[PDB]
Each structure stands twice: as structure tokens, then as C-alpha cells.
Design an enzyme around this catalytic site. Structure first.
Site, PDB file in Angstrom:
ATOM      1  N   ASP A  35       0.838  -0.869  -0.221  1.00 39.88           N
ATOM      2  CA  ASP A  35       0.027   0.454  -0.482  1.00 39.88           C
ATOM      3  C   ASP A  35       0.974   1.333  -0.151  1.00 39.88           C
ATOM      4  O   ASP A  35       1.082   1.413   0.763  1.00 39.88           O
ATOM      5  CB  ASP A  35      -0.713   0.321   1.228  1.00 39.88           C
ATOM      6  CG  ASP A  35      -1.894   1.339   1.011  1.00 39.88           C
ATOM      7  OD1 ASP A  35      -2.323   1.802   0.571  1.00 39.88           O
ATOM      8  OD2 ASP A  35      -2.509   1.358   2.144  1.00 39.88           O
ATOM      9  N   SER A 199      -0.435  15.430 -11.911  1.00 41.70           N
ATOM     10  CA  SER A 199      -0.675  15.189 -13.776  1.00 41.70           C
ATOM     11  C   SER A 199      -0.761  16.201 -14.126  1.00 41.70           C
ATOM     12  O   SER A 199      -2.013  17.270 -14.112  1.00 41.70           O
ATOM     13  CB  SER A 199      -2.087  14.745 -13.446  1.00 41.70           C
ATOM     14  OG  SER A 199      -2.474  13.988 -14.766  1.00 41.70           O
TER      15      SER A 199
END
Length: 330
Positions: A35, A199
Site C-alpha cells: 500500500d 498530473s
């Protein structure tokens, strides 16, 4: 040193991936959920409340000659999905794919929430976010990667998750045969303890690319792609009959639909998520309403590039003094 381990989807939807981890001496192999959005290595154990164990493999520290109670240490964690777990702490030898760390904090669960009990395939979590998020008290502990870093050939790990198939976690090296083209690296903020990046935009299907900054986290422990409501609406508007359902808890779409791809930007590069990766199947057995793999992050407080996005790429988690992320197509 290096390590390399195969990671395997837990079910036919790729809801999560499990990676075998050797703990203790002799080894006790548990299948952990790696994770990159958390920083605790915790396991089902011989200390876990018996009614909260239902098919998981447990760590028994009393059977490990290298286990040592970390005196006074406790842990307690709550995840973004509302699940939680807590317990005490041992140090022990932990190996992943041939890479060994001695003295790793292994957080033994005394209590786990129902969602963990109900998932027999996941024996615990191995956190790969920054150690500042580790919950051990009163002495915070380091992640497996943080402990291994100095020994690794290069201070990196890579995630290569498969679509409906196994993939690979590598530690200490870049497998240049595992991706196409080049890896585009992008800046990371560690201020919230995550692999947080920005992004450069998105496209829906064959549509034009929208240049827009989308801050989010690279999170292998989250199944889906959670993005701003504007972006998510633009995606699902291209699927006839798709709608947000408050009762189901997100966007659903007719199972008869063919889904468009979704592209996200990494600098000037582009990662394409095929439409099929966005199908999470019937909302309940036999239903013709299917659950979408792109969902709104409104109310979560952060955008999350979960497995839906990451499995479309070869992803480099560069833990150099100034961390960065790399993405390549594959």
C-alpha cells in the site's frame, strides 16, 4: 541488494493485489497488500481477536526465534475507506522477494474492522508511503522500504500491476524490459506523507487532451481512480446510460456498454487506461448495472491514482533524497 516479488489480484475484478512476505524465523509467509498510501506493516496474528479472524493466515511471534516485543509500542490506523485495525508491535526479520530487513516493525493486530475479517485473502498490509505517516506510538517506526533503502542497489521500488493478471513489485532496480518507451519522471510532494504528484491533464476516449493540473497520490492500496467531479462527469457523459447513483455510492453504467479509454498526463507523456480497466462489474450478483472504475474524489479531500490508473503503467517510486515518481507505458 535487490528484491523482486510477484503480486497477484485477490479476485476477478482486481479489487486488490497480494504479495507474499516472509516474516520471522523460520519464515511465516503471509500475503500482504502493498500500500503506497500508508506506512504501517501490520498483520493478522495469534493476538487477533478470534472472532475477527476468518480464513487469514496469521503471524505467531512466539514461534519466531527472531521476534522481539517492542516494549510499550502500540498502533492504530484508520483508512480512507472507513476500515481500521490496531494492536501491539514486534520487531522481526522480514523478507520480500529475496530482500531481507532485520529489525522491521511488524504490527500485530489485536483488533481489525469487519472489512478485513470479511476478506480472507489479505493477511495484512505493507505500507510504502513515507514513514512520517507510521502510526506506532510512542516511537514511530520505519517502513520496510525505508529500512531497506540504504542497502539497495538504487533507492527505488517499482510497481507493475497487472490487469486481470499477476504483476511485480521490484526493490532496488529498474527492470528496463518491463516497459515500453521511456519513463517520465515528475515531482513529488511529501508534505502529507504520500507519493503526491501533479498530473498535467486528461482525455476521454479519442477526445482532445485537456491541459489542467490535477494533484493526487499514487496509491496501490486503493482500487479505483478518484478524480475531481468535473473530470469524472466528462468521462461518464461518454457512456450512454451512465449516471451517479447516491444509493449505490458512485457512478454506475449499463453492463452492456463499451467503455472509452481514459488518458492522464505525466509531464508531456500520456498514460492510456483502456476502457475495460474501468469496468468493476455488476453492483450485485446478476444485476445489469455495473460499477465504474473512475469515481469522484469530492468529499475525500484528495485525488487518488489508485490501481485502475497505476495498472496501466510501469511506476517508479524513487526514494532518493528528493523523491520523484516515474511513469512508463507498458
Amino acid at each position: 541488494s535487490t528484491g523482486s516479488a510477484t503480486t497477484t489480484p485477490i479476485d476477478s475484478l482486481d479489487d486488490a493485489y497480494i504479495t507474499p512476505v516472509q516474516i520471522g524465523t523460520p519464515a511465516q509467509t503471509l500475503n500482504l497488500d502493498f500500500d503506497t498510501g500508508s506506512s504501517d506493516l501490520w498483520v493478522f496474528s495469534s493476538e487477533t481477536t478470534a472472532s475477527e479472524v476468518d480464513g487469514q493466515t496469521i503471524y505467531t511471534p512466539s514461534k519466531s526465534t527472531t521476534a522481539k516485543l517492542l516494549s510499550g509500542a502500540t498502533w492504530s490506523i484508520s483508512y480512507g475507506d472507513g476500515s481500521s485495525s490496531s494492536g501491539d508491535v514486534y520487531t522481526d526479520t522480514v523478507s520480500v522477494g529475496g530482500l531481507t530487513v532485520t529489525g522491521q516493525a511488524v504490527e500485530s493486530a489485536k483488533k481489525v474492522s469487519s472489512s478485513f475479517t470479511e476478506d480472507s485473502t489479505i493477511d495484512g498490509l505493507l505500507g510504502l508511503a513515507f514513514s512520517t505517516l507510521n502510526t506506532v506510538s510512542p516511537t514511530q517506526q520505519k517502513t520496510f522500504f525505508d529500512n531497506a533503502k540504504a542497502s539497495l542497489d538504487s533507492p527505488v521500488f517499482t510497481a507493475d500491476l497487472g490487469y486481470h493478471a499477476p504483476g511485480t513489485y521490484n526493490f532496488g532496480f529498474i527492470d528496463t524490459t518491463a516497459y515500453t518507451g521511456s519513463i517520465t519522471y515528475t515531482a513529488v510532494s511529501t508534505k502529507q506523507g504520500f507519493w503526491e504528484w501533479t498530473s498535467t491533464g486528461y482525455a476521454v476516449g479519442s477526445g482532445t487532451f485537456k491541459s489542467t493540473s490535477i494533484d493526487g497520490i499514487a496509491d496501490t492500496g486503493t482500487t479505483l481512480l478518484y478524480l475531481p467531479a468535473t473530470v469524472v462527469s466528462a468521462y461518464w457523459a461518454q457512456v450512454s446510460g451512465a449516471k451517479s447513483s447516491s444509493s449505490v455510492g458512485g457512478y454506475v453504467f449499463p453492463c452492456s456498454a463499451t467503455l472509452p479509454s481514459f488518458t492522464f498526463g505525466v509531464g508531456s507523456a500520456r498514460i492510456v487506461i483502456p476502457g475495460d480497466y474501468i469496468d468493476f462489474g455488476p453492483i450485485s450478483t446478476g444485476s445489469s448495472s455495473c460499477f465504474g472504475g473512475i469515481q469522484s474524489s469530492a468529499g475525500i479531500g484528495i485525488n487518488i491514482f489508485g490501481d485502475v490508473a497505476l495498472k496501466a503503467a510501469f511506476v517508479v517510486f524513487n526514494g532518493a533524497t528528493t523523491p520523484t515518481l516515474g511513469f512508463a507505458s507498458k
